[PDB]
Amino acid sequence: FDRAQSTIANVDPEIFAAIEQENRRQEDHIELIASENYTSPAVMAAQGSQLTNKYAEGYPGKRYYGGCEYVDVVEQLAIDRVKQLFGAEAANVQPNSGSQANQGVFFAMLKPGDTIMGMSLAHGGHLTHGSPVNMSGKWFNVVSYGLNENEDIDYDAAEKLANEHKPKLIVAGASAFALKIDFERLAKIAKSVGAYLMVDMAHYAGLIAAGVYPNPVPHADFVTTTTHKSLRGPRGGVILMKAEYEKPINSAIFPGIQGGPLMHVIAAKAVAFKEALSPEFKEYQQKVVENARVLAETLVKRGLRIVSGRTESHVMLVDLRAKHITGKAAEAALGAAHITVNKNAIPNDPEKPFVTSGIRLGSPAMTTRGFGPAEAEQVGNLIADVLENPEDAATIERVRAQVAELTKRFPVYR
Amino acid sequence: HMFDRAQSTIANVDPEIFAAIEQENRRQEDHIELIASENYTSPAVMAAQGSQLTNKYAEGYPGKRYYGGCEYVDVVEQLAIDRVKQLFGAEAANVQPNSGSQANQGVFFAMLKPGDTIMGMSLAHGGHLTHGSPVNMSGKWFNVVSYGLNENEDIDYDAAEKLANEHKPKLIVAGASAFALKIDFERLAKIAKSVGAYLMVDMAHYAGLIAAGVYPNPVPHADFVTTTTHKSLRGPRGGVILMKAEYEKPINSAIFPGIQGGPLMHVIAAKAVAFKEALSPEFKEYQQKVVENARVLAETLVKRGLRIVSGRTESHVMLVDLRAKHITGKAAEAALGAAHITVNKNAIPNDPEKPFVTSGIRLGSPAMTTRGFGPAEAEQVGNLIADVLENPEDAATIERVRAQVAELTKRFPVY
């Protein structure tokens, strides 16, 4: 309890060693998982603070425990900054995760058995948007909408489904969709059947904050997000809501589905929001969008296909059929070449769900460590090299060596 | 640069947050903390959840992840699982729950369907929010039957048995947020078995005492045992589920993909560190002092004319009946807080006051024991509390106590 003696290395050598290896792994691999980023030392320092010691059930100025004057300052800063970031009427920064943020809306507005609409998992929707093995799909009646022939969201079909099934709530947002979503149109659809509109902007949140992806907040009743993806913050969730839903949302998070908030993580959220308000962050996201486009363009030049035909965001779904390789095989081969991606089903995938014909790629992480258009293009070409000969030892090695050059030249943490 | 560890300090990036954390650091030093659910976790634990492991998406379980590159977070999580199994002798464990509430929700999601009947200890008598409160998920989406204390303010096992037979709960919850005595988990297991119900024990408050062997272990008797890692266990903020091997698959499926997504791997690393610390002989010695200090505190307050619910404590915690000094729980909390003693108000059985007022305060010894308080200090603290309670609005009294608190806090620094 002098920070000198209680180090991880002294107290728990096994865990220290494992953490050290993860540090090096983060340096030594090019990360293209669209949901991952590298958060700042300041953010990490914040959730490594003594604020973990405080029980603070309730909300600023209305706590159940005494001694909360300073954690109140922290939480209110987090609330005010995130409201400022997205122009929200109200906010809740206590959700433990993106899942809990989404569960909070559901607990606030719905009863078990209610009908909801969400984007289908097969076409890029998330687990929490109605999967039958998730709470959202097991305890509720789920109707899903998907993509059209152009692999854009099929707004007409969604409208038809809404009228047919009369959902109490409509979910929009996605984990693997490259285009701009028309939140205004989904809002009209929701209003026309008297449904709530909830937008899960977890993946796009950083882009939205920087103004390079459309903002769902003026159109939706509820907007949920993670703080750790494109927002580049700590791991956790946030709910944004219209003022009229402030009381049900706050009551749903506590005492509804959570207990004591993680005040150290909320402090870390506040720091990330401060960073997101800066001109440097806007410039970062402009580069994120640029690098994603260049990556997509490069893969197309090498004969691959991009689902929806283009990206208008940080993310892309790559159709691998022209190179006669499965997503599963592609993920494995790229991983061996020190490029981290994940397999992902494409629309009308001829392969089994655990195999797939696609991979999802994203630019936030590589952009954070300093990659520009030249590097994004180089990475595109390296991926294609692997895909065209995934089991050739010499091919994997040549790429790995070039990956090593990039990662050494662009360190994550200095 | 934004990712240079020299330049990216909290003070450099965010001076306002720096200032608030600094004030909180000093607040933790300058107050005697007697909130029974709070502790001071080690720098090693804090360092772990301040690590780069926050950057990793690791949906799934060790060796069965959906993402690549999880080799090292797998080592971390498996160490956490193996150590917590070792601490409590559990057949299986899940260390991903984001909180105690999510731990409890995980069991419910695994074993129950909305509308099912459950039994839990009543909130009025020391049960927790997640044990069937109608404003909590546990009580709003399920049919709740609650059991409480008897005339001696011990758990009324006979009444619980009658209720179980009458209502046929699918699941019985045991454990408490404010109960001083040893709970008879074996008897509750028998009652549960007799009606074919699952037994879930929420040992959040007692977990550290149980690990050190100074409070009875529910693991050999229960189907499921849930806990927080931040209370008497003295770890990071988060949850854990312990379960019999036969329930390994439904429990793991319930946490993911059931109710959570990517686990907080940095926090799980911190959990692992906390479990390593808990396995040491020093931790057992700590919990012996916790139990001793709680007893001494209780005895001292009784000497000053207060009453302890259940008549004694056999743990870290006590509920103090304040009526003899004609002061409410709310007023007591406020007055003690001004004297730099942190407590929280709490209803007593058959409390004549409104729920927001109460006639009691809950006290615990884990935090003060952690910063080094012994029996002499525990007794002194008991007397200081009584001094405030007997004259809660006297400025001179508040000042004298505050001065003595300052002497103690200076003598026993936390960090």
Ligand SMILES: Cc1ncc(COP(=O)(O)O)c(CN[C@@H](CO)C(=O)O)c1O
């Ligand atoms: C759109 C969206 N919404 C919620 C979540 C879950 O948040 P957690 O903090 O992990 O609970 C996600 C998470 N996405 C992961 C896994 O599906 C991803 O790689 O996209 C999400 O995308």
